Amino acid sequence: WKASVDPLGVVGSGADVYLYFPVAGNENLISRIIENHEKADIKKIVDRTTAVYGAFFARSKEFRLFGSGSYPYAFTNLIFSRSDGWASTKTHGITYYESEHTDVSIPAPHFSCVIFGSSKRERMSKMLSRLVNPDRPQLPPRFEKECTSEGTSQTVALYIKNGGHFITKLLNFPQLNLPLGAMELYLTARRNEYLYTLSLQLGNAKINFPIQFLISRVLNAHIHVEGDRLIIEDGTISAERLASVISSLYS
């Protein structure tokens, strides 16, 4: 069953936000996000991970994460200590570790699964069943491309169904509840900030040159419209604010 695993089919269909982080080049950002949510075992896992695939579900308030990495027995044995509030349970052989808000499995030496969030978060055995029968989420072409680029790219990818709501956060405005569609967002680290490009689905709504210029100057970015999509390129956001924007999905 480990022969062919699509991590996006494992985190599941129907998410409000899909995320992909190559760990190399994005260490500080991922550390900050983890810190915002509460400890050592998760950081330890990340330090052995090459790529993280994530899905956030607003209704059940949870993140589901899948990591590709190297998780040998000598490593796993030394984490999930009961003095840290981790309980283990035994199941087709696999061990599950549970805590108040975080469940973790290492179902094979190169895969990790983490489910974090409210008491309505998915059961680990249900996520693990998607190792055998995966879901089939639909993702945009560059997001799909980034997901198979580990080693060649360090671009962080997000796909956000409610792009209206996210754009206000990302651009530091207040919550307006804009009538806009899906957003694709691609970021790459420069020093302590991120450079990004995004596309935002506008629908039939027009955006005139005045609103365009003002956002543009606010962001110090190149902006244009293509068909029904607003394209922003060369925007910047600090790694600290980016981490907060992502963290703020939960709570």
From Swiss-Prot:
This protein's UniProt keywords: Cell outer membrane, Lipoprotein, Membrane, Palmitate, Signal
Biotech use, per record: Recognized by sera from 43/43 syphilis patients, it shows promise as a diagnostic antigen. In diagnostic tests for syphilis this protein exhibits a sensitivity of 98% and a specificity of 100%. A fusion with TP0453 (residues 32-287 of TP0453 fused N-terminally to residues 38-450 of TP0326) exhibits a sensitivity of 98% and a specificity of 99%, and both proteins exhibit superior accuracy in classifying analytical false-positive samples than a commericially available test, making them candiates for diagnosis.
Modifications after synthesis and translation: Palmitoylated upon expression of a fusion protein with first 46 residues fused to PhoA in E.coli.
Sequence segments annotated as region (Amphipathic helix 2): 27-34
Region: Amphipathic helix 8, residue numbers: 209-219
Pfam families given in the database record: TP0453
Region (Amphipathic helix 9): 239-248
Region annotated Amphipathic helix 5, chain positions: 124-131
Subunit structure: A mix of monomer and dimers; may integrate into the membrane as a dimer.
Protein name: Outer membrane protein TP0453
UniProt source species: Treponema pallidum (strain Nichols)
Top-level taxonomy: Bacteria, Pseudomonadati, Spirochaetota, Spirochaetia, Spirochaetales
